Design an enzyme around this catalytic site. Structure first.
Site, PDB file in Angstrom:
ATOM      1  N   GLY A   1       2.062 -11.751 -32.823  1.00 26.47           N
ATOM      2  CA  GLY A   1       1.252 -12.480 -33.667  1.00 26.47           C
ATOM      3  C   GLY A   1       0.185 -13.213 -33.321  1.00 26.47           C
ATOM      4  O   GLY A   1      -0.120 -13.543 -32.086  1.00 26.47           O
ATOM      5  N   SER A   2      -0.792 -13.625 -34.091  1.00 20.78           N
ATOM      6  CA  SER A   2      -1.937 -14.311 -33.584  1.00 20.78           C
ATOM      7  C   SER A   2      -2.499 -15.023 -35.022  1.00 20.78           C
ATOM      8  O   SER A   2      -2.366 -14.762 -36.173  1.00 20.78           O
ATOM      9  CB  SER A   2      -3.100 -13.278 -33.207  1.00 20.78           C
ATOM     10  OG  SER A   2      -4.062 -13.776 -32.565  1.00 20.78           O
TER      11      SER A   2
ATOM     12  N   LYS B   1      -1.477 -18.139 -30.365  1.00 20.75           N
ATOM     13  CA  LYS B   1      -0.491 -16.766 -30.578  1.00 20.75           C
ATOM     14  C   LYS B   1       0.915 -17.171 -30.502  1.00 20.75           C
ATOM     15  O   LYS B   1       1.382 -18.158 -30.028  1.00 20.75           O
ATOM     16  CB  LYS B   1      -1.006 -15.815 -29.180  1.00 20.75           C
ATOM     17  CG  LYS B   1      -2.479 -15.884 -29.004  1.00 20.75           C
ATOM     18  CD  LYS B   1      -2.921 -14.810 -28.059  1.00 20.75           C
ATOM     19  CE  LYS B   1      -4.344 -14.533 -28.438  1.00 20.75           C
ATOM     20  NZ  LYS B   1      -4.969 -13.508 -27.019  1.00 20.75           N
TER      21      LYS B   1
ATOM     22  N   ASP C   1       5.090 -22.408 -47.905  1.00 17.94           N
ATOM     23  CA  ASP C   1       4.452 -21.270 -47.723  1.00 17.94           C
ATOM     24  C   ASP C   1       5.450 -20.249 -47.571  1.00 17.94           C
ATOM     25  O   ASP C   1       5.163 -19.303 -47.253  1.00 17.94           O
ATOM     26  CB  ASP C   1       3.835 -21.282 -46.213  1.00 17.94           C
ATOM     27  CG  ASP C   1       2.960 -20.302 -45.960  1.00 17.94           C
ATOM     28  OD1 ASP C   1       1.879 -19.823 -46.579  1.00 17.94           O
ATOM     29  OD2 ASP C   1       2.535 -19.834 -44.722  1.00 17.94           O
TER      30      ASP C   1
ATOM     31  N   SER D   1      -5.463 -18.890 -36.011  1.00 11.43           N
ATOM     32  CA  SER D   1      -6.399 -19.965 -35.683  1.00 11.43           C
ATOM     33  C   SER D   1      -5.657 -20.731 -34.697  1.00 11.43           C
ATOM     34  O   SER D   1      -6.323 -21.193 -33.698  1.00 11.43           O
ATOM     35  CB  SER D   1      -6.236 -20.838 -36.892  1.00 11.43           C
ATOM     36  OG  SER D   1      -7.504 -20.213 -38.044  1.00 11.43           O
TER      37      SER D   1
END
Ligand SMILES: CNS(=O)(=O)c1cccc(Nc2ncnc3[nH]cnc23)c1
Ligand SMILES: CNS(=O)(=O)c1cccc(Nc2ncnc3[nH]cnc23)c1
EC number: 2.7.11.1
Lengths: 262, 268
Positions: A20-21, A26, A131, A23
């Site tokens: 995943g990656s 990572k 979220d 702002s």
């Protein structure tokens, strides 16, 4: 004040493949304290990292992500370690893999999520995920589910209004646990249909349609009347009309009984 | 703080500088958490004075905004005392015909349509002016208490105490969170103006029978608006329906509000 057992030296982490990656930095798959783990590595910003950790170290429930530790040695070494969950996100299963699911599998997921959320909302110092979506519901290979990714999560906070614009009123008002119930409602619809809410719109168009013009994803024969009623109350525009997660769990467990019996 | 006051003192034209000893304070005409508002006298002129109780930033900003103001539909700044924080005061014109809130809800006076539209149009112009400055100002507290009335029937926007210079994943968000992601735009004043326009037409305080926070709640979460009777003319009901649109992007700009109300005055 992070209990010292949760402190981690970088030397305790074996980094493997990136998974995943963004702002922040990572996310890696790896190995730590004799477990397979997900490690969220980092590059105002420090307060957000400290909040996330403060919250992750409170978590202990089978339907919520399992915290392993954090590395605090210096700003360039920041990292959050959790158990790795190998079955992938709910988002992938429904929209990318398009695995066809029986109704029982769907309810197990939705109930597991509702339980995790009930857990969070009923701690001594309640936690709001903020979220909740299908990217942040991860699945075990057995079909059980947990709530993941607490990067936006907050601890619940303990004349002119008559003429205020609604968007202004909303900003001077405290963010509540009932906002998580709204998001869940969308996930619940998303699970039953197997469709992205408002698939035809880009995210912001969709949010505007929901907020301003009251549009909601369409309900049909794909959704039985006990659940469809939960969906409607779940995404009520008035937070106070939305059910508590304790109510959500009972109704879905009852449905789960009747679908197992049949 | 000492540096902020001196910088303000330096940018503030000389005629606006006042000593608290030059101000005479008669009776209280306005209130608030900030302090109090008085009728009074300064240099032999009847004036209105805001007296003061984070508070330095607020004072420097309010004075800053005030000395930019030069339009007949917007309050006339007369001066300030910025000697030290204990003495903070703000002086503007005094307007003897009182607030719109008083006229409508305390004196309960009856106005004909023309008189109503003149007020509504003056407020609209004032807001147009603020919004179209090179550096737009947002009012943020527009209501019937803050619209003041000359006896010739014209009006001005007053009290810039809440004013400011204008500066995911969303698909799953709750509407009351999605809305916490956007800041206070110009279109929030338009909404506030809409209620004032309804207030003017009916003579009733919006949601008179509810407490402010419940009125706000009904408007935001339930999407309820003050009833629009059949008696209200179409061009105005059109402005209301749009002006208090829950979608900010759907509310008209004030220049358009002005344009529409001016037309009505040509038919009235
Ligand atoms: C790193 N801990 S976190 O704050 O909860 C977090 C944040 C962002 C993305 C994840 N993803 C996954 N985490 C674990 N297993 C997985 N399998 C497939 N994706 C993930 C987790
Ligand atoms: C001090 N100037 S202010 O910040 O704009 C201000 C703020 C609040 C209330 C007023 N009132 C009046 N001001 C002038 N004339 C009047 N007649 C009847 N009430 C007022 C003025």
């Amino acid at each position: 004040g992070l209990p010292s057992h949760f402190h981690l030296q970088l030397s305790e982490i074996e980094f493997h493949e990136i998974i995943g990656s963004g702002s922040f930095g990572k996310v890696y798959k790896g190995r730590c304290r004799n477990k397979i783990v997900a490690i969220k590595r980092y590059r105002s910003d420090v307060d957000m990292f400290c909040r996330e950790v403060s919250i992750l170290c409170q978590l202990n429930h089978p339907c919520v992500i399992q915290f392993v530790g954090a590395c605090l040695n210096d700003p360039s070494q920041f990292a959050i370690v959790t158990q790795y969950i190998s079955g992938g996100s709910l988002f992938s299963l429904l929209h990318e893999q398009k695995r066809i699911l029986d109704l029982q599998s769907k309810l197990i997921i939705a109930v597991d999520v509702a339980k995790g959320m009930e857990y969070l909302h009923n701690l001594t110092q309640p936690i709001i995920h903020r979220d909740l979506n299908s990217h942040n519901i991860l699945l075990y290979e057995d079909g059980h589910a947990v709530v993941a990714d607490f990067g936006e999560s907050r601890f619940l906070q303990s004349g002119n209004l008559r003429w205020m614009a609604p968007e202004v009123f909303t900003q001077c008002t405290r963010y509540t646990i009932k906002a998580d119930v709204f998001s869940y409602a969308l996930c619940l619809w998303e699970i039953l249909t197997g469709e992205i809410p408002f698939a035809h719109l880009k995210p912001a168009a969709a949010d505007m349609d929901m907020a301003y013009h009251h549009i909601r994803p369409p309900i049909g024969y794909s959704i039985p009347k006990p659940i469809s009623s939960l969906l409607i109350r779940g995404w009520n525009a008035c937070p106070e009309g939305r059910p508590e997660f304790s109510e959500v769990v009972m109704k879905l467990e009852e449905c789960l009984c009747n679908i197992e019996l049949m």
